[PDB]
Amino acid sequence: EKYPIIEGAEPFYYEGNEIGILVSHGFTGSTQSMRPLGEAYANAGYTVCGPRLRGHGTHYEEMETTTYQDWIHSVEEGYQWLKERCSTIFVTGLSMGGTLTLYMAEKYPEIKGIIPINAAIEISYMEAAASLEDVRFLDAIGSDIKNPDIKELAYEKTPVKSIGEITELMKKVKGDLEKVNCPALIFVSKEDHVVPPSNSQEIYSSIKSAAKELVTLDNSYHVATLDNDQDIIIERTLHFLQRVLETSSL
């Protein structure tokens, strides 16, 4: 209990039918940014897993000590929980959660479809910040939200050591984008002040999926899962899941 889980940052698990959705939060963030999506998908009947990434939802000094392999493992552990209960699995995530969504689709051909939201593959400023030798923390990246009455549960500082980890993860995932073949629904905000929207556009044009769509959210900033266009993400995701699940030879 050096670094207890902050109230509202707990992992979430909803037992439903044999179709599972893995839902990943992003870097310095928490499940609080993703639970509205998870609840909506659970209400539609699906089994849902929203893992807490290692070092997240506790303290930024714990995050500072974590590796990108730790964050991958948190997602792999949630994938395993779904595999114990589900025969078909989809993955969705926000920002670095979208990077991890792409990582999973690059590794597992069995994944049925992906829904990355403002996914991160190349952020030149973070590449430079990762190289700072004498700065421990930079400012928070969280709460880039257009609706002024909405707040995100995310850390108040960003560890420089952790920036190096996300930079390495992004480089790996970016290099492997041609391994993605499953249906993809890519959401991107028009005015994202954290992850360049061109990242999602490059994902769209680099993956090999025969079925791909990019949806631009005109009324949201980076944390779109909590922002004005949350309803578009939820409803269009549900339509996408239904269409993939209903696909037949006809």
Number of domains into which the chain is organized = 1
Structural domain harbouring 114? 1-250
What gap in Å lies between CA 88 and CA 244, rounded to an integer?
11
Experimental determination technique: X-ray
How many CA atoms within 13 Å lie on the side-chain side of 246? 6
Q: 4: which DSSP letter?
A: P
State how far the alpha carbon of 141 is from the alpha carbons of 41, 167, 177, in Å. Answer: 27, 15, 25
Instruction: Name the resolution in angstroms.
Output: 1.2
Instruction: Give the residue numbers marked as catalytic.
Output: 95, 192, 222
Find residue 88's DSSP bridge partners. 19
State how far the alpha carbon of 250 is from the alpha carbons of 80, 103, 184, 243, 245, in Å. Answer: 32, 31, 20, 13, 13
Radius of gyration for the alpha carbons in the chain, expressed in angstroms and rounded? 17
Q: 65: which DSSP letter?
A: T
For 78, residues 6+ apart whose C-beta sits below 8 A from its C-beta are 11, 22, 24, 49, 50, 51
**CB-based contact 66:72 (threshold 8 Å):** no
